[PDB]
Copies of this chain bind each other. A is one copy, B any other.
Amino acid sequence: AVSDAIEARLSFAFMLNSAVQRTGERVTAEEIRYVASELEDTLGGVYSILSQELQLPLVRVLLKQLQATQQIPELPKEAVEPTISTGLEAIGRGQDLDKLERCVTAWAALAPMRDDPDINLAMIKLRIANAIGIDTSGI
């Protein structure tokens, strides 16, 4: 019993998906999702640390190493010292994409008044995008 009590505690600290595996009770579905979002919470911890400690320095060195051996076909001055994004940004499923179709879905909220009696949909469709935080340049 003591060994299994410890082995469970460790299984959490090694992001083992089989720490939910408690042979004690009829494990529900609503705790599985919640105790799994504690494994994601402590993993997002080490990931956002190693992004700074090992991911970005590795890219930053390869960038300057490959521009120096001219395998990088030259580009207009604006892109020789850029900004290096990583994480959910680079997978393509980042906060930017979130805020846009979180704003598209707020313009379907004023569909039961697209035919607006003096409501003025023009300023609202702009303030909605203001609070969210898009660019609004040319919308």
Chain A residues within CB distance 8 Å of chain B: 12, 16-18, 20-38, 41, 90, 92-94, 96-97, 99-102, 104-114, 117-125, 127-128, 131-133, 135, 138-139
Contact = CB atoms under 8 A, between A and B. Distances in A.
Given A18-B38, A119-B139, 7 more contacts: A21-B31, A23-B25, A90-B133, A108-B112, A108-B113, A114-B117, A118-B122
B109 A101 contact: yes
A132 B31 contact: no
B92 A104 contact: no
B35 A17 contact: yes
Contact of A22 (B21, B105, B110, B128): B21
Contacts of A104: 106, 109-110, 113, 124
A25 B26 contact: yes
Contacts of A117: 114, 121-122
